[PDB]
Amino acid sequence: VFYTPKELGGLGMLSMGHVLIPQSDLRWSKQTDVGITHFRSGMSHEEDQLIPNLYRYIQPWESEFIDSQRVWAEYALKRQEAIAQNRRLTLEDLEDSWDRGIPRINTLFQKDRHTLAYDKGWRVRTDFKQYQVLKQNPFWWTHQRHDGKLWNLNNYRTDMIQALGGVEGILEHTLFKGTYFPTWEGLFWEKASGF
């Protein structure tokens, strides 16, 4: 109920504790026309399933810095050559260096890249934002525009869905089967009733 992502009805709560999932919460049954059938998730006799912790889904600063040096060297070598060959760069070349480097390479392709060239001292004013806005900003130290988000959660959510039993392993806990939709595709959540 907790670690299920938000659109599947859960709260999408991140975790950094050794949270064990009992094997009584990875079992789901569906009634085909011929007859009821039952399923588990650890279909081979293995260890107890464990919620993935955020600890394993954030690259260490050391690796990020050395990779930033290497990736910016690659970009410099891939741009000075482009001067001689007379063509602009493209997503095709830099996809291998995507989402890497402390000023993330994806920032170069950002729409407002020109105006952010005239944004100087942005980190200092981000730090002093605490005195102007009431609620503290957890990401005071950076700014998503100027160096991109420095973390990825797609793998984390992938592994959470995999460990929780998937769409049917989570929906068995829900009231989804009571609603009787033929399949879970083609649905949206009305986060706000009109009334």
């Binding site: 504790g17 050794h18 600890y55 394993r56 889904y57 954030i58 690259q59 260490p60």
Partner: peptide, 22 residues
């Protein structure tokens, strides 16, 4: 079995931060 969160202190013997996140 219980839903209480167990501290992963002493649970880091065979894991790294960058592992399972490429």
């Amino acid at each position: 079995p219980t839903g209480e969160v167990l501290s992963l202190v002493g649970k880091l013997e065979g894991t790294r931060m960058g592992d399972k996140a490429q």
